[PDB]
Symmetry: D2
Subunit: 373 residues, 4 copies
């Protein structure tokens, strides 16, 4: 799951079953906060490292006590006699705590666009969410990391973000704010910026090529050929109706449309069992590790088709960090961890990370970002 959330959940459970969760529990909260701050400083030798081995690194001193006190007044979770705090609520607590930790401020806010901004299969379609990103764009750089691989063609990427770009053109671009907006395609392969006319344009590759570690063209082609052989073997033994699609630095297994239960004349994408997709992801990672590949890559499920890309969203996050000359403490990222189950590419060590189950919680977290100043 996520060992840190389970740590706080189990503590709150045991505090609840003692029938003292609604009294003054500041001694427990302050002790947990002092332990969290003691992991902020001297992280490798903190006591939290022994209690939880996969804490990672904390880049800010979060006020978990003040965050709990603030959230509890809003939802009154301590008043419930029969329902103790849940996994979802503790996730909300740590989200508010991470926002409150950034007292000095941040300059880079990144969104895993596949997970939070647009609902998969459609374009940006949230007028209120565009307004929150709008006012925040003025104060800080906002970057968008998207897994779509359209090479460096900015028109295809604009089709998904057209509504937000139209909002930019109407209200943001007036006072030079528009320069702060950045978009990252592929995983770390294509970069796009915004212009005065509110239209996406690809940044020259030579400007940001030096920041990223080079990956040999022979090595990536080796990766795609391995993935092609595995996907072909997986289609053969499961008798699937899918095909392998190869991009410049991307390869995926996409289902073929077939006539289905709709009578006479209609189509539906061939449903591939989610279990078969996970089996394929494990086979691909097993074969890639067998060939001793050090180059970073990401093989993810993400819906009904499987895709293997070179580079990970963490690499694009660190690219934007090093390019904009921002320290790691002053940048945060909004992304959903339910979609990436096994991780191995989680950015908990690259930048601050927020967990937001649906676009409505994104509005709530972005409202808190507005209130922070």
């Amino acid at each position: 799951k996520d060992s840190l959330i389970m740590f706080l959940v189990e503590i709150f459970r045991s505090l609840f079953v003692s029938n003292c969760i609604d009294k003054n529990i500041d001694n427990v909260l302050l002790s947990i906060e002092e332990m969290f701050i003691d992991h902020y400083y001297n992280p490798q030798h903190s006591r939290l490292k022994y209690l939880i081995d996969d804490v990672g690194i904390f880049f800010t001193k979060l006020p978990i006590t003040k965050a709990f006190h603030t959230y509890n007044k809003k939802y009154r979770i301590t008043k419930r006699l029969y329902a103790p705090p849940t996994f979802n609520e503790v996730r909300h607590i740590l989200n508010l705590a991470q926002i409150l930790s950034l007292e000095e401020g941040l300059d880079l806010l990144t969104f895993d666009a596949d997970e939070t901004l647009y609902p998969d299969g459609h374009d940006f379609n949230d007028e209120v969410l565009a307004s929150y990103i709008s006012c925040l764009l003025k104060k800080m750089n906002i970057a968008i990391v998207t897994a779509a691989s359209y090479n460096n063609d900015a028109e295809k990427y604009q089709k998904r973000l057209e509504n937000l770009l139209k909002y930019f053109s109407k209200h943001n671009i007036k006072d030079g704010s528009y320069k702060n907006f950045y978009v990252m395609g592929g995983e770390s392969n294509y970069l796009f910026k915004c212009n005065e006319e509110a239209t996406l344009y690809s940044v020259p590759e030579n400007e940001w090529r030096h920041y990223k570690k080079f990956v040999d063209y022979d090595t990536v082609q080796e990766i795609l050929n391995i993935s092609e052989k595995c996907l072909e073997k997986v289609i053969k033994d499961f008798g699937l109706c899918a095909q392998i699609q190869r991009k410049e630095k991307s390869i995926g297994l996409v289902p073929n449309k077939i006539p289905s239960l709709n009578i006479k004349n209609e189509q539906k994408n061939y449903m591939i069992k989610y279990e078969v997709l996970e089996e394929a992801v494990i086979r691909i990672k097993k074969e890639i590790i067998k060939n001793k590949i050090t180059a970073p890559y990401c093989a993810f499920n993400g819906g009904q088709d499987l895709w293997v890309d070179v580079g990970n969203k963490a690499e694009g996050l660190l690219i934007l960090q090093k390019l904009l000359k921002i320290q790691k403490k002053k940048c945060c990222h909004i992304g959903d961890q339910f979609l990436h189950s096994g991780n191995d590419f989680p950015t908990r060590f690259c930048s601050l990370t927020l967990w937001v189950s649906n676009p409505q919680e994104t509005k709530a977290c972005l409202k808190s970002i507005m209130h922070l100043n």
Copy 2:
């Protein structure tokens, strides 16, 4: 055979959920739901509680897979499990399968679980997976296949949990392809619809949700008198409707079916609603909720206010347990159902198991010839006991309901 002797425990609580997998607000698309079932710590206890028999088979197949022998001749293990299943069919009480699992229920047919496994495996080749063992969704598909293949003789009654399968996300019936399967099945066998919605005795309100479906019924079914076999049940076991010549529901006279339902002195009914109303009012005050209470004749509910204002899922669970505890505190033995919906809370003085038995006794159908289409993710086990009333099939989405009904259509 009777609701009085059937085990309910309406005022019990399933062990608490900290991960809130039932929260269909956070879980959104089916992709995120399927991720958590792979991780055992995320969903184990919640899962097995919904259907322990399936989990029992998951553990056997898991050990078969990790022994690296799941793809060899495993017919000895499967035949042994089938032999336990048949021995539980012949002698359900005090069987050995009953000893292993207390809540296994009753089997009404000889389950050919071996053939169901061989056929399901041959179609999807799930045994070829070297790194992913068979998951919970696939063994529940096998149990569906085993129950369909078991049902060799035929059916007379088909029942649908209408809130779960027929209505998309609370909307009205809007699946024309599904109507064709339902119409062809009504021609051959009786079709019963049980829905938790309580619209008093207003037949037009119940028809409004089934308006699209009844249009297909009037187009093709009205020709051969199959419409008489169609029945709808309101409340949970409180109101009964049949179909007339036109595509409109007409209420069955109360005197015709009154005796089949277990008697409730009615004074207790409104005592239940008064306790629930006081608890919900206190819950609204305590959490400052923006909601309204809708009270029916024998039903009461807590519904969010129109913008819909969001009610915290955990507050809904808190209020359900408060109502059950306060109902115990007044020592009320009447069978009822207080369930936690996605956005709404509802307390009904009926149970869908009670209405299923009422439909069985009215139509004078034996239990072997009765089946039920229902999703076991949403309904708690204490409110509706699984496989105690009839054969039970599990369907997660309208597509699997289509496939099950198509397979039932080609029966024998």
Copy 3:
């Protein structure tokens, strides 16, 4: 208040143990027993089943320790737990503590758990441990301290599970230091001994095990008539003996105490023994065991043959469950106890909870003024319900029994 309404479930089974921590053959010295309690996967489910209330406190203190606040002012958590304990003392049925734990039982005294924690911590400084949280053995010591400190008014009855505490490894009583504590306590309060051994109505055989203890009784206690308060109970609740002028046991007349025990038609008693004897004979044949069956008037047992030939512990567990299942198959409702000893198997048509209540009613003692010294590792929960009859203390070895009795000696 009565054995008839008390919850037994004599024919139930505790969830199976794969690690066999109860196997005192493999576990040998107390060092190896203490190792496994630190690992949660080794002993969790088995432990909590023996005393869930203690485990409930372990989880709270575990979360307090991992919060790195167990050594700060934790009096708010402890006072809240104490407030739940007192609320469970006033209203045990339907209390909130009863909601958290179903098998908590009844409290007969206001537990000062806060003071018991503060005193136990101040003596051993268990809160100073930075890497090891408080274990199960230390919280069960605190519960012992909380129950002794709770008992403020005083005692009239003291009961010993003789098989567990008095006899060393099945030998006769051979602890002269313990006799002094027992003698001083008899002077002030009545002392009752319940032992599972069944020697028919032979008072000399029961005395042979207590011969060393009765020598001390005759030396110091006989002077002040305290010997009259001493009572011994054979079988499990079948035979009763008192003390006479000399250091010899004399049987209490049956007519004096017959009515207190729940009636058994006796014909069922021998039906139970016949079922058990047939099951044990089949078990001996099936596993080729070298053992003998000893049948008493109202007791029957399976005992290893003299060289002692070793009987596999798991075969003993298998035979216990076989006997319970076959007893159910004949639908026998009489309260009995079939327990799995270390080397022997025994089926008694009595229960130590039934005999404890018989001693309570005979001496006309209120439950608040009754206590029991017993080890909860050996006795299963279904046979002897914990804290349903009187206050219960947990003792692992003769040394802790000495310390508890010394603390009881200085009471008020």
Copy 4:
């Protein structure tokens, strides 16, 4: 616990609940055996490595199927309708499987003397067990690893093994078998052999010094001083009545005798809570790791007193292996894993290891060693 045992236990449980455990289950057993042999060959890339990460290395092809079939006829564990196979029984199965795996034979048999041979606090006192070691001594070298630290004084070590040495003198030493017997004191610090007169004598340190990796005298003294400071701090805050005892290369915390509950005039060793001893072991390991000590050492509980020695029983096992010029496949060790809870010194990778809860199971395992030839 021990992940491998749990693997077999859970499989046997699921086989039992299917009500097929008494039928022909050779397909499951042979598949598990083939998987075990496939981890014997190419161990780093075996499928067992993925299913169980801590399998370690297997030095022989064990016949787990034949071992189960042999054991089942003896105890009829498949006939039990209500009790599935336990942790103890599966441990017995793997013991028999490891014995049967040594078809070619072994030349070195080692006993953790603290755990199996003598019951703690007493000397060797098993006439029948001495007979089994007697006949086995002729065919193979038998070594004894004991944690007692008496320097290189052979008289103190003979006091614990006097009964077995007397058995050696009467029946073994007649035909030159006595030369095979070896004893290892400390952990890997003192070595003893047997002579014609059946009396222990210390082997010269220079003969076997080269095989063991050298540990600086400054480093071991650093270890003992750290342990002395920790034990002193532990005695101070718990108010214990114990004292620190320092040997050449050993240091321990030993309880002080105090007058106890026995009236007037008697003594008893001060009881130290087992929880305090575990807390001290963790503190000592934490401080030693903080000072970056690479030298092998062992800090164990083992009763009522705590002892910290330099070197581990694994080092003595490998010393005797390299000294006697024996391949790892032809040597086994009999020791109990209940006493060493957290391990970190388990010899599952050094040699074959048997698990034997009491001296009676040692007699049973040594009878099987007799039957192997």
